[PDB]
């Protein structure tokens, strides 16, 4: 039920670095964030399809998917314990049919006209002015980005 | 919903080694097992803890890393350890499982098989067999209240688990 928000950028634009700065800023504001990331590349090998491993510091659930990739984002969010969370950030999926902020950096090897802005995009965080039908954000102002995220949250109540 | 079954033994008796061979044997009969385990190691070091380390270090309290062949959820518990067995089992996707095996916890209050190996230096008289025990798997004959299984007969053990499972449904 809690809000899901994707972040999208071309490689080399500095998305991971930005996320790493954005999370503590959200935390500082009382937000408890989750994150879902898509990547490429003995008793599990013995054949337990699902394994929980619990320690003092933390616990893990590991789910083997040998025949078909798990790509249903709403299903994955539902695995998290949302009683402990206010927001789930998302990155790296193809058919992201949720709200999305796009990152742009002018010297990062792409012209502004190459940007693809679909109907789910709510904002573009950029280091130069752009001609757009959505909110335009300063990508080098993380505090201000945290502001925009919180306000978007306080509007998603339902 | 689905049956939970613990395996219990003193350290060094042969619990993890036994489970290493039983799980394949169950899978061969078409049983799809889950596993819940306790560990004393630092989960940040492997695979897949390492994959989510930077994001959790920055403040992400729960992470999922999803790829072609598998996905992993991590839940940070910096205040108190998670030891609620029924909660843990409920976070599994039980629509795709038949049986959940449980191992390594100090307190495990469910159906249980207890293990004994003579050469481990303990006397059989020191075995604690409470009301939850359905069998003792042993390498020496014991005359017991509950079933007595050969700890070295893995297929026999897999048969006994199926038969117990039939009584649950």
């Amino acid at each position: 039920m809690i809000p899901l928000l994707a972040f999208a950028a071309w490689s080399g634009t500095g998305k991971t670095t930005l996320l790493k700065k954005l999370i503590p800023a959200l935390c500082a504001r009382g937000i408890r964030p989750g994150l879902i990331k898509h990547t490429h590349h003995e008793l599990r090998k013995a054949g337990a399809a699902q394994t929980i491993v619990a320690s003092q510091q933390r616990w893990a659930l590991m789910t083997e998917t040998p025949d078909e990739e798990e790509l249903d984002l709403q299903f994955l969010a539902s695995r998290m314990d949302t009683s402990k969370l206010d927001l789930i950030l998302v990155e790296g999926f193809k058919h992201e049919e949720i709200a999305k902020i796009v990152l742009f950096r002018d010297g990062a090897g792409h012209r502004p006209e190459e940007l693809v802005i679909d109907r789910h995009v709510i904002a573009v965080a950029s280091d130069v002015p752009l001609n757009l039908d959505v909110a335009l954000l300063d990508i080098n102002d993380v505090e201000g980005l945290a502001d925009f995220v919180v306000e978007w949250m306080q509007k998603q109540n339902g």
Side-chain angles (χ1 to χ4, degrees), chain A:
Chain A
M1 93 250 167
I2 66 182
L4 297 153
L5 189 57
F7 266 79
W10 293 299
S11 158
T13 297
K15 168 164 67 54
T16 290
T17 297
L18 173 89
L19 284 176
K20 278 191 282 174
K21 274 126 112 155
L22 180 66
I23 288 147
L26 287 173
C27 277
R29 281 143 209 239
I31 310 295
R32 304 119 89 209
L35 195 141
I36 305 180
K37 174 192 207 232
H38 184 266
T39 52
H40 296 80
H41 185 77
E42 225 142 300
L43 300 124
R44 291 219 276 103
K45 222 231 176 123
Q50 288 177 65
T51 294
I52 284 167
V53 175
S55 71
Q56 198 178 301
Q57 291 84 42
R58 59 208 141 233
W59 66 275
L61 179 265
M62 295 151 298
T63 295
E64 200 80 8
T65 62
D67 289 320
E68 154 118 336
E69 236 206 302
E70 186 58 78
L71 290 177
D72 175 345
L73 267 189
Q74 297 285 345
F75 170 78
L76 288 168
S78 81
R79 306 295 90 201
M80 289 182 138
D81 179 6
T82 149
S83 84
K84 309 209 174 285
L85 305 167
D86 309 299
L87 171 73
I88 300 167
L89 295 165
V90 180
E91 63 175 335
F93 291 85
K94 279 177 174 279
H95 222 44
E96 266 153 354
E97 307 284 270
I98 50 176
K100 172 170 57 232
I101 291 179
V102 168
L103 310 182
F104 182 79
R105 280 202 200 269
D106 193 43
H110 289 87
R111 282 159 169 78
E113 324 95 71
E114 291 164 27
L115 283 166
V116 175
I117 318 292
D118 69 44
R119 56 200 175 90
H120 306 289
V121 177
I122 68 163
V124 177
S126 186
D127 67 354
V128 289
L130 302 166
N131 184 30
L132 304 161
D133 290 334
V134 293
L136 168 77
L137 309 166
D138 187 6
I139 195 181
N140 290 313
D141 174 24
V142 181
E143 294 302 319
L145 171 61
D147 283 352
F148 182 91
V149 169
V150 167
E151 264 75 298
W152 170 85
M153 271 170 94
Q154 297 182 354
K155 182 221 107 104
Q156 299 293 305
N157 331 303

